[PDB]
Design a protein around this ligand. Structure first.
Ligand SMILES: Cc1cc2nc3c(=O)[nH]c(=O)nc-3n(C[C@H](O)[C@H](O)[C@H](O)COP(=O)(O)OP(=O)(O)OC[C@H]3O[C@@H](n4cnc5c(N)ncnc54)[C@H](O)[C@@H]3O)c2cc1C
Ligand SMILES: Cc1cc2nc3c(=O)[nH]c(=O)nc-3n(C[C@H](O)[C@H](O)[C@H](O)COP(=O)(O)OP(=O)(O)OC[C@H]3O[C@@H](n4cnc5c(N)ncnc54)[C@H](O)[C@@H]3O)c2cc1C
Lengths: 482, 479, 481, 482
């Protein structure tokens, strides 16, 4: 078989589907997944084409973080022609994929100085290093915003050509473009990848059918590693992916207005963040919470909804307070256990993975699609994706000391972002008493691996049985690679 | 007989007519969407003593409404038996709790919460109702923020709750079993000539003939009848008391054994948790009088409801899964009292304007209207709440002006705000003049209750002017 | 026969008055300066606190129940004691008594684990004692005008539990002491002189030597440091630390004041909120408490803000616009083992009256009469024997009880602020506080556990101060076992 | 007589006393006032040598405000030689008048955007227009400060050569310098100025004595107009001066440290503000509240102490929380009813006034002293100070509309500076309901005069009898000058 099966109907599966179908007109490409898109990250996304907006001091302090950032900057260059190529298969009445061209990053004091001040400086430095067009602007010159004065920004940064897409219109344009290129949509889920003699044979679907293929591309979001891990040896050779459960909302604004740009903060405690993405027709998207969950979750918590709404109404626009809630959206960011994506080939011939993209898979989609298609055609794809090969020992991108400093800072940031009001001795007391328990957990989990802060907090507050199972997992991975 | 409306009141009267007049054809109108429907957004509490306020019981009309709530409570056990009888085990149980605990905390105005707790205690003793003031430590399940915790608690025996969804299903099933016909269209127009109902034009363009039309269309009820000659200024207006509630799957699948509630709070909102089967709880409920209907929750309503429940009832709700935000319109009568009974048009009846407690009163109200339709006198104390009336003036302008300022201040204390200590007295002083000026400008004789007065204060000048005209036309009609 | 009383607070002056009145055979000299450096008494309201001072934690220990019984006994002495002190003065000297009754308020600006438990404990103690009291409607509490979000929802009227003006009390004690033939010598003791196991007298800070057959040490928080210089007494007299307390005198906006004491139960680390009536359009508001390992004679910013914020929200918003006349600071003598030091020593003629913490002023007439009885060869008051100053440290609670208490009191500092936090934070803080306090308690000593008020001070002290206390506890164990 | 009596022993009386004594060695100069300095502004001052730091958008929007600012810049140039001349009369052990050379202005969000953002921009503009040395600096580069992250600054401005003096050391140096120049200190208060045939005869003192003089200089702070108003016709010809009651504190810092510069915000609601002025010997000065009172007050309110302490501990240094309170200080800023100082001569020969300087008489003192001494010697003194002659119709420096906008903004700023936490609809509700009552008060007080916002709020919350007496005062002033 020269047949291709793409497992997954999010932005990544559809993007790779479109690129395969367009580049290999001679081959059958079939894409699996259902219109419900259960736990789907893409439909819950605003979405920001986040490159410079996603910069943190912590990410850029590591070689792996600098490599991930370079790929985000490369992906941004592909978006204008990618959108042109997808809108080309449609008409005016399909709507516009692009909802804003530019982003304003706001700096307010509703957060930790150790995150927000460090991250604002890191964004400014990254923009200058990349020769990207940008301007620090007067807050008074920021269009539309009407914050609570006690929650207001005092600095603002205009990022030119860093925009947003309507994630729903993007998915519709990708499906339309996939069909135009001769792709076939089969609305079932893969249950099992079939392989023997180190080669893919095809996919068993959840209706009990078997589909043969020479190539299987796994882009099933947070389910991607669980699907591949069933193959021989791969349980401790493919890094685990967890559910980065994210809550967002669609709001009909009081007057039908919206901002001309994305409005956002830098990434905040445990990779949450505040942003507003413009939409057509008097709607705005507000996001977005983040919680790594050891099992998937398909509903928003009360706490997530209150935090998102409170941040947006105070820090962006008080008019949102009186605005109508249209939809609370929940999706799972694929959260890799070592903090880096799983992109490329396996020890199994014709088996490819595109997953573990967490906050910025949608942004990276055109670059990731082209990378995997290049590899499938015997090329080397995009330089600097090599470290993010899916079959690997867990990456250790930071020292245990760096992660322990980070997890305590992020824990304290949950207070400052609330924002809390406490006696002034309490924060220093909590900082001192948080250090020991996180140090003890990190030392107990493994002699070699340290989970990033976002996962470490989830493990700290999980059941003893869940902690013990992860100790076993890390020990089995060490055994496999050392 | 045509019943217009498929909420608790329309279906309850439909069931009572169908069961009592097997010789007559009874058709009930309304759609499964139940647009703006109050009943499906209700918990619901069978609220009698829990609904007591000092302000309500200070007026004759308020004391009359309370007496009817106490009477209605006695009908519920046999009413539920009669509705469950038409179903099987798999249909679920209408009753979700037998008892209520009222909590007193300091996340509110002393001028409402302290006065209302005393009024509830007095009303229970006056009625010889079974109840006990209990230690807060003895209230099962609750886990409040210590800064938001109750310091007093009141156990009300035999004041419980129903699943409003299971009630609606049981009413529809019981209606069909009694030979009622469900026609899933809306009435557009009531047809009448020579002072008699002819029937109803539906929104599919059809005409249904009838000798009797019962209007139970919730917040749409007066707008529907007001098109008939002279009735525009003879049937009190009904507005949308937009209410937000939520269904939450609890973190551990647990729930309280009783209703948990505060007394009624600023502008007839209030905090309660109603138990549900299957690891779900109902939390409610906000209230905002809107001059035009609204079918979606505001961000502000969702945050206030969630913040109150997580702090004052159970911090575990914070980590619990949001299943559904519900929005419905409490039918809010302009004079603060229900519209129940006959009209100057033969065969035209109304059951509406029940605001917070139509669902609780439903079996009593249904039996009252059915008695009237059969030539009886129904229930003694409902006469004052006849739908064709001059607007009731249940309070002095002075009482309402004191109340609207107190309720305005209570929106601060219920938040709860943190302000410099001179600000509250400053705001109290500067609120008095503008509300006095509005009340004096609206009418020489009528004063809207606080819940509506705040909505009018913050409405457009054109909406205020239209109400000035309405009140003047009502005065002209009745005086 | 010469007697020297070292200290010019309520306890020194009360014992001075009782000796001078009772012992025509003795010349009695009282030392101490009008500045009353670190003086607890002048910073006190003061409440005649017996039932108001009840906590669940105090009454859960035998030692705590014994201390409470003595407070109830002391209350009965006050009417005749005041009569006897005012008798030596005229109308123009003012009235010692400022209120007859107390209202205890319960609000939610605090930890349920302290305030709810303590309100129940006060109610139980009143009923057990058959003391006159009534739970009253909050609406019936005169004068108060709280923030609605800080308001009480329960109130308790305690009949015959009142207050005195601490300044007028001190003036009446000095005047009564002089009338009875006592001599006031306004210098400080630097050294107690003893040889052949007997007191010889006192070296004063002007370099003089005063001979005496009897020396009574009532020098507040300085009492143990003064006696500890004598042979072996460093590990035989329990340490007394400074329970630094801040209070204020406020001239009310309209010159009004409440007719009763207004108070909460005792709150985090033995602080609490109260208003004590004063004459002439003044009110006393108090009072903060922080155990300090070294003395401190000035209020911190944090103490002033906390006291003022509590009083303006929980008692009367009118205090916000009222004039601040005086911020007062004094040291409650805080015994390391949580119980007073009252009676005789292994040194003939050496006596101690100290370590009374929150309620030495209330207990003063009873404590004074006890020590004077002992000095005259009597047995004084039954059940004050257990509080003899020369003792092994008392262990009135298990390590487990104290560790539960210190975490609860730590959390209460948050709820009393009151803080506003994400709802998961309190449980997180409770979990992460347990280990560090357990580790400290285990490191300090195998046998002794400091009470919560001192344990928090030690937790946040320098490593050198912690190490010195480890050595102290080890030297005490060595001396007594 | 050619004798001079200076009435008042604050910075202005002593500064003019020193200048008279030094310039007229042939004349007897006697200075009245007691060491208690009842209601004294000077001893309660930090004090900042505030020129650019005192800039507000509102002040610089009026001609009179721009004139006052020019005089502050001129006064700054005199301080170095003035201090040299005062320290010259002392020895090393008397200590140093100057406590800092430079100022950092901080911008945080614990206040109204309508004051703090507008005022920060106005300070920056005034510095650039004056070609004054200054730099916008990174907040991370501000030494010493340790704010609550939720109360932290996000912008900071370093003003070179704008410093501070120890007000206590200044007063001691002025008294010593006055004696060195042949001045006599008489520690009694003036009760009555004696004048007949349009000429001063001298002063009756509160010990019942009479002191003859050819010249009487009234520099009695907030008591200055009440003292002169007893003379014929002067009740409606000398603008009233009220008590701008100000609370400040001396704190011994936890570690004996202090900042190297003044730390301040711009002027905030009703001319209060937050600042820390360095002192020698492990002490810092924190200030300062401001409340116009229609009668003098010599004690801090609970509210004033809490607000000052809460602002300093959160916005400047959390270490102040655990620091020892040494002294709460209270003084009366002389608050002129028309918002401008009273400096120069009267219709009574030999009668002079130096008062109504509100926030910046201490800073202006060397310039004001030299101006009045020039006038007494038949000169014209300093060009722009003629407009602030004490015998005048009330100045109307702003429209009624401007003042009504200002009073509502300042009222709302008392909320944001607290900072309050309120439902988001409440601020707009309060703004709407404040407008009518202030408009009604302004219209009722006078057809021609409008009190500035600081006084208008005091009048709004005064007794009906106090409002009626001011209506009569304004009517009598109109009658006198029209
Ligand atoms: C948030 C919330 C909480 C509540 N909680 C309680 C509680 O705890 N206890 C309690 O007793 N009650 C509660 N209630 C309800 C209260 O008692 C109401 O007064 C009562 O539900 C009114 O019922 P109704 O049948 O008159 O109106 P609805 O329940 O609104 O029913 C009217 C129906 O008529 C339909 N309709 C409208 N126009 C037409 C037309 N032209 N033709 C046909 N159909 C039409 C509507 O779509 C709707 O389904 C609550 C309500 C809300 C919103
Ligand atoms: C803020 C506050 C509030 C209080 N409120 C109350 C209350 O409501 N009710 C209550 O009953 N009690 C209250 N107290 C006081 C409490 O009861 C104390 O335990 C009691 O005052 C202790 O009295 P004392 O005489 O032992 O000590 P102090 O009152 O401290 O007297 C000791 C005196 O001895 C002097 N001295 C020290 N060293 C020497 C020396 N070497 N030579 C000579 N003299 C020396 C000191 O300068 C001082 O004047 C309060 C205390 C504080 C600080």
């Amino acid at each position: 078989q020269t047949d291709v099966i793409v497992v997954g109907n999010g932005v990544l599966g559809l993007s790779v589907g479109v690129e395969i179908a367009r580049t290999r007109p001679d081959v059958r490409v079939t894409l699996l997944g259902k219109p419900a898109r259960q736990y789907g990250a893409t439909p819950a996304a605003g979405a920001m084409l986040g490159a410079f907006g996603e910069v943190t001091a912590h990410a850029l302090a590591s070689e792996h973080g600098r490599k991930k950032h370079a790929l985000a900057v490369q992906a941004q260059r592909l978006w204008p022609e990618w959108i042109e190529s997808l809108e080309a298969t449609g008409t005016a009445a399909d709507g516009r994929i692009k909802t804003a061209d530019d982003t304003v990053v706001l700096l307010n004091t509703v957060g930790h100085s150790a995150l927000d001040d460090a991250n604002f400086a890191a964004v400014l430095t990254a923009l200058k290093e990349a020769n990207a067009p940008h301007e620090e602007i007067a807050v008074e010159s920021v269009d539309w915003i009407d914050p609570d004065p006690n929650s207001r920004p005092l600095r603002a940064l205009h990022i030119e050509g860093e925009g947003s897409v309507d994630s729903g219109i993007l998915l519709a344009a990708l499906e339309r473009s996939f069909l135009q290129a001769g792709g076939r949509l089969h609305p079932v889920d893969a249950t099992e990848i079939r392989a023997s003699h180190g080669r893919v044979e095809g996919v068993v679907t959840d209706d009990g059918d078997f589909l043969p293929a020479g190539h299987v591309v796994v882009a099933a979001g947070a389910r991607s590693q669980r699907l591949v891990a069933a193959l021989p040896g791969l349980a401790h050779r493919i890094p685990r992916i967890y559910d980065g459960v994210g809550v967002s909302a669609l709001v009909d604004t009081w007057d039908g207005s919206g901002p001309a740009t994305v409005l956002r903060t830098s990434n905040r405690a445990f990779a949450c963040g505040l942003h507003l993405v413009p939409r057509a027709g008097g709607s705005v998207y507000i996001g977005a919470t983040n919680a790594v969950c050891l099992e998937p979750r398909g509903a928003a918590s009360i706490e997530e909804t209150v935090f998102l709404f409170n941040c947006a109404t105070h820090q962006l626009h008080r008019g949102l307070n009186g605005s109508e809630l249209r939809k609370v959206q929940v999706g799972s960011r694929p959260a890799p256990i070592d903090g880096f994506p799983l992109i490329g080939g396996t020890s199994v011939e014709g088996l490819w993975m595109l997953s573990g993209t967490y906050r910025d898979g949608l942004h990276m989609s055109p670059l990731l699609a082209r990378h995997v298609v290049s590899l499938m055609d015997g090329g080397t794809g995009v330089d600097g994706l090599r470290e993010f090969r899916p079959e690997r020992d867990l990456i250790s991108a930071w020292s245990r000391e760096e992660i322990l400093d980070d997890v305590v800072r992020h824990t304290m940031a949950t207070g400052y972002e609330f924002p809390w009001r406490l006696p002034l001795e309490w924060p220093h007391m909590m900082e001192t008493f948080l250090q020991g328990p996180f140090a003890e957990l990190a030392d107990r989990l493994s002699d070699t691996y340290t989970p990033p802060a976002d996962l470490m907090t989830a493990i700290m507050f999980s059941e003893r049985e869940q902690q013990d199972e992860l100790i076993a997992y890390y020990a089995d991975v060490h055994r496999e690679w050392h």
